[PDB]
Structure 1
Amino acid sequence: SDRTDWVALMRAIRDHRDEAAFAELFQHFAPKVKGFLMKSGSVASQAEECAQDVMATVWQKAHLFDPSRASVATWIFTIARNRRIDGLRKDRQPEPEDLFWGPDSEPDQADVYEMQQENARLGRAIARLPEAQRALIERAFFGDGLPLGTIKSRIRLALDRLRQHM
């Protein structure tokens, strides 16, 4: 499904301010960002508030998305968690220096294809965990041995490339 080809749609926004593409993304990720934030302990109304904000940011920072280092859902997760957390911050989680490909270039189709592959592998592993290890994971990302090795390795690899270009 090309309407579901998240990576492709992100490039649509990056290069053509393709609003349909954005709608395509929004209709899929917004509700997930909401449900996610609620599992995190937010009230519906405040979740929907953040969801919308996260999606608006997806549009503004569209150029910062690098399909060779993360899936779109991971990037979006990145924007959801970096929101304001009162008892922990004034504005937003301080985040590291922005490393992005300028309009002149883009990561190798291969590096992208692989990044997405290893990611899909992590997804799969995550899904089949017996309900006990799956909770260990959730408790961490909500309040409080996975193949991260492979994913860690690709990013490390993809990151070096980005460096030679700059």
Structure 2
Amino acid sequence: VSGAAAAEAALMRALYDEHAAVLWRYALRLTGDAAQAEDVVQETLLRAWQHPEVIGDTARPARAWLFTVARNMIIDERRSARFRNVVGSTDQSGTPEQSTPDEVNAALDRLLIADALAQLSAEHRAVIQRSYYRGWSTAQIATDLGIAEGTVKSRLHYAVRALRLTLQELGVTR
């Protein structure tokens, strides 16, 4: 009936009162972290609820099964996922903060590229800014501009060398 289902929860509560606080200190000595010991205790008692063979015989010690399960839980937690990550904390001192270099070289190169782009015909300038700035394919630019495929190919081929001519005349390093 309805009381048979409440008897099971009343059974779990007793093993709580008698074993959970004692298993917590064991897991705490094995790990050293209390917030992790609480997780260990909860998972162990969950597996206890899932195994009626351990809750069946009262004439057989049940605390030892809990200790062994907690030990095999902590030894598992002590493997690969903990192995790599657990080492460092950024908030903790002794860890270098991530730095990013300045954009000086990139800014100067961008200025020179824009200058060399100004001295190109509208067609060449509108072609190189659709292949490198927009990253489109060779046929996409041809479809957009309403021109042929080899037309885009030749326009890129010449505009690249025109930029090279304008840069070498200003002493841009190879």
Bigger RCO (CA 8 Å, 6+ sep)? 1
Larger C-alpha radius of gyration, 1 or 2?
Answer: 2
Q: TM-score range by the shorter chain?
A: 0.3 to 0.5
Q: TM-score, normalised by structure 1?
A: 0.38
Structure with the largest fraction of helix = 2
